[PDB]
């Protein structure tokens with residue numbers, strides 16, 4: 001029926017949870033996939049998709065290789081943007097915030113909590129660096145695949161994650177004649193200020 | 200079967216055209232939808248989806264309201280990033296370049312080349328500005344819908360477009376064990392330098 005201000009929950013995460021739930025329900029591919037935009041030292045933005053793994057009032061979490069380009073960029077400029085490309089459901093969610101590193105305890109908890117082959121793969125790829133051949137990846141995977149073979153894959157020191165704070169959350173939902181519904185939740189004084197934005 | 204360097208075309212657009220074609224062929228929702236990231240004066244990146252409307256060696260084109268936030272941001276920092284979220288087909292394409300304004304001739308040509316109701320809608324929405332109620336949009340739409348009623352909708356002076364140059368184009372294609380194929384085409388000396396990147 002549309003998106004009216006009077007139906008908006010006070011906490012934007014309530015609305016986000018609802019939309020995420022419906023995305024899963026609709027079997028959209030990678031419902032947790034979001035595009036993370038970061039900015040390099042020259043003011044050049046860069047983008048790549050990562051998976052949302054957890055969220056709460058403190059922010060949205062994703063894991064990545066600490067030697068990657070996104071990691072280097074975040075270290076020089078912590079300001080990031082997240083966008084959930086749910087246009088198949090005529091929706092978009094955009095989050096603006098600062099990326100902060102997760103602690104070792106959190107990373108360990110998640111790391112050992114995933115496909116064994118994925119843990120090994122984390123060791124293999126020096127994410128974002130130029131490599132001369134795909135073969136390097138496959139060779140290392142096999143080599144490590146049996147080096148760790150009898151125990152449990154160790155957490156690589158170069159693997160970690162970030163939590164993006166919720167400074168702003170924007171919801172977009174398709175609208176007739178190109179007049180879409182847009183609401184911007186803006187964190188202010190321990191509260192959320194809501195404004196409709198022209199499409 | 201995978202993505203090997205030996206099968207890469209010299210011109211990245213050849214590969215892009217192929218992937219775009221297959222995306223349409225697969226009936227993915229909004230095959231031309233791409234996430235455009237821009238950066239504000241504080242170094243804060245922002246994102247939103249727009250539709251690719253044309254592309255060639257000079258770059259990728261999209262249209263938008265010239266009073267919008269993305270437009271203001273581009274005017275302060277022309278460096279943008281484009282990402283085609285084709286993860287349903289285990290693919291991503293990322294473009295890095297500078298956004299340049301399109302001329303009036305180009306904009307007029309495209310503008311009058313689209314749904315009449317969309318032309319009218321372009322007049323209605325002061326894109327990105329805070330509005331107090333959805334009603335403002337609907338009222339104006341009706342008002343203009345009959346003001347232009349007998350002729351052809353005029354091109355709003357505040358409507359335009361941008362062409363993003365091709366400085367870098369990155370292709371990503373899903374790979375077993377989390378070891379994906381990544382190739383970065385980098386424009387150099389009137390030519391393209393190709394490097395595989397660790398996933």
Ligand SMILES: Cc1cc2nc3c(=O)[nH]c(=O)nc-3n(C[C@H](O)[C@H](O)[C@H](O)COP(=O)(O)O)c2cc1C
Pocket residue numbers: 030033046047048049050051052062063064065068069070071127128286289290291371398
């Ligand atoms: C559906 C999907 C999910 C992904 N999830 C992650 C993730 O959670 N963490 C990660 O580091 N890379 C992930 N990637 C790979 C990234 O898009 C990117 O290639 C990689 O992180 C390197 O980006 P960077 O060079 O900008 O640092 C994913 C790709 C797709 C298509």
Ligand SMILES: Cc1cc2nc3c(=O)[nH]c(=O)nc-3n(C[C@H](O)[C@H](O)[C@H](O)COP(=O)(O)O)c2cc1C
Pocket residue numbers: 087090091092172199229232245246247248249250251261262263264267268269270326327
């Ligand atoms: C599938 C899809 C296609 C869209 N295409 C465009 C477009 O071509 N031009 C445009 O201005 N906005 C488009 N939008 C709306 C934008 O995402 C965004 O709301 C708007 O441009 C304002 O962004 P801004 O406030 O950052 O300037 C589209 C949204 C979706 C979901």
Ligand SMILES: Cc1ncc(COP(=O)(O)O)c(C=O)c1O
Pocket residue numbers: 065066067068122123124125126127158
């Ligand atoms: C898998 C992997 N990731 C990341 C890194 C390294 O980060 P850095 O760029 O400091 O070498 C390495 C480094 O040797 C590595 O093997």
Ligand SMILES: Cc1ncc(COP(=O)(O)O)c(C=O)c1O
Pocket residue numbers: 178199250262263313317
């Ligand atoms: C605000 C806006 N402008 C333009 C477009 C698409 O371009 P066009 O209407 O010229 O096909 C969209 C598509 O969703 C849009 O939301």
Ligand SMILES: Cc1ncc(COP(=O)(O)O)c(C=O)c1O
Pocket residue numbers: 264265266267321322323324325326357
């Ligand atoms: C539909 C629309 N778009 C854009 C603009 C304006 O751009 P500006 O922020 O300079 O007022 C207007 C301004 O009155 C408008 O009506």
Ligand SMILES: Cc1ncc(COP(=O)(O)O)c(C=O)c1O
Pocket residue numbers: 051063064114118377398
């Ligand atoms: C490089 C990389 N790391 C992590 C993930 C997903 O997180 P996880 O493997 O812990 O489920 C992906 C998913 O595509 C990925 O490509």
